[PDB]
Design an enzyme around this catalytic site. Structure first.
Site, short mmCIF file in Angstrom:
data_model
loop_
_atom_site.label_atom_id
_atom_site.label_comp_id
_atom_site.label_asym_id
_atom_site.label_seq_id
_atom_site.Cartn_x
_atom_site.Cartn_y
_atom_site.Cartn_z
N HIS A 222 0.81 -1.20 0.00
CA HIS A 222 0.00 0.00 0.00
C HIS A 222 0.86 1.27 0.00
O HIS A 222 0.27 2.34 -0.18
CB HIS A 222 -0.99 -0.04 1.14
CG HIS A 222 -0.50 0.41 2.46
ND1 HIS A 222 -0.19 -0.44 3.51
CD2 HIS A 222 -0.40 1.68 2.95
CE1 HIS A 222 0.14 0.28 4.57
NE2 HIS A 222 0.01 1.63 4.26
N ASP B 37 0.09 -7.52 1.86
CA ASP B 37 0.56 -6.12 1.86
C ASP B 37 2.08 -6.11 1.96
O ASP B 37 2.68 -5.80 3.00
CB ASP B 37 -0.13 -5.32 2.97
CG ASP B 37 0.15 -3.84 2.86
OD1 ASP B 37 0.58 -3.43 1.78
OD2 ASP B 37 -0.13 -3.09 3.86
N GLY C 37 2.51 6.77 8.45
CA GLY C 37 3.87 7.19 8.14
C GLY C 37 4.91 6.15 8.55
O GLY C 37 6.03 6.22 8.08
N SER D 45 4.08 2.96 7.98
CA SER D 45 3.70 1.91 7.04
C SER D 45 4.89 1.51 6.20
O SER D 45 5.65 2.35 5.71
CB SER D 45 2.61 2.37 6.15
OG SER D 45 1.46 2.56 6.91
N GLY D 46 5.03 0.19 6.00
CA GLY D 46 6.09 -0.35 5.17
C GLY D 46 7.36 -0.68 5.95
O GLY D 46 8.23 -1.39 5.46
#
Ligand SMILES: [Ca+2]
Length: 223
Positions: free
Chosen positions: A40, A84, A175, A177-178
């Site tokens: 995402h 994801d 922020g 995320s990942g």
């Protein structure tokens, strides 16, 4: 990261910032040429920033390297956030040293109760907005599959786990995320989703990396 602590400069040497004019997501360096992040977080025009602490100041340990290719998981579903995960190949190999280093992939999955380190430049408030300049860290345990499913009925797949605190106050956030969830020196999760941040009974939900190691390795081997 809500309710965490300042990591210390370059203490999380596999943490990357994905930059498209600004920080927008974390990632993890898994070898000199490849980053794992969340699907995402996909966009075009990514610059991978390695060796960062303050993302707004050039402090001397940075490596900025453009992405040459992005590969979103074949089965990523953006509605459910199942699968994801994405891989980003760097245009050139990073120079690996004590402050810029790869994180090991898991050979086996982690279990509920294992403590892990979650890191990122995401929001630090749960009822507010404040984005840090320096890297933040949170130590958090993996939660049972049953407590994860109870927190988020109908939403947790076999490719997701929960980590954090059901009482609230400590979580990853927008922020982050990942970015990484590292447990006993292995990349076990990717910051994926959650209802708000640090809310009671709404723990963080993470991509379960150990399910993807075969895909990661074969993708690297052919790209
Ligand atoms: Ca910097």
């Amino acid at each position: 990261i809500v309710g965490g602590y300042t990591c210390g400069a370059n203490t999380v040497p596999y943490q990357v910032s994905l930059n498209s004019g600004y920080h927008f997501c974390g990632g993890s360096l898994i070898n000199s040429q490849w980053v794992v992040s969340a699907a995402h977080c996909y966009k075009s025009g990514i610059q991978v920033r390695l060796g960062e602490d303050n993302i707004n100041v050039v402090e001397g340990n940075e490596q900025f390297i453009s992405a040459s290719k992005s590969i979103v998981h074949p089965s990523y579903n953006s509605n459910t956030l199942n699968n994801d995960i994405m891989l980003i190949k760097l245009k050139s190999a990073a120079s690996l040293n004590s402050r810029v280093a790869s994180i090991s992939l898991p050979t086996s999955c982690a279990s509920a109760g294992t403590q892990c380190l979650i890191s990122g430049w995401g929001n630090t408030k749960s009822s507010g907005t404040s984005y840090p300049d320096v890297l933040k860290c949170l130590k958090a345990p993996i939660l049972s599959d049953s407590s994860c499913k109870s927190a988020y009925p109908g939403q947790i797949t076999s490719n997701m786990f929960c980590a954090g605190y059901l009482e609230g106050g400590k979580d990853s956030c927008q922020g982050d995320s990942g970015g990484p969830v590292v447990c006993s020196g292995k990349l076990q999760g990717i910051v994926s989703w959650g209802s708000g941040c640090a809310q009671k009974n709404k723990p963080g939900v993470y991509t379960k990396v150990c399910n993807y190691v075969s895909w990661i390795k074969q993708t690297i081997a052919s790209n």
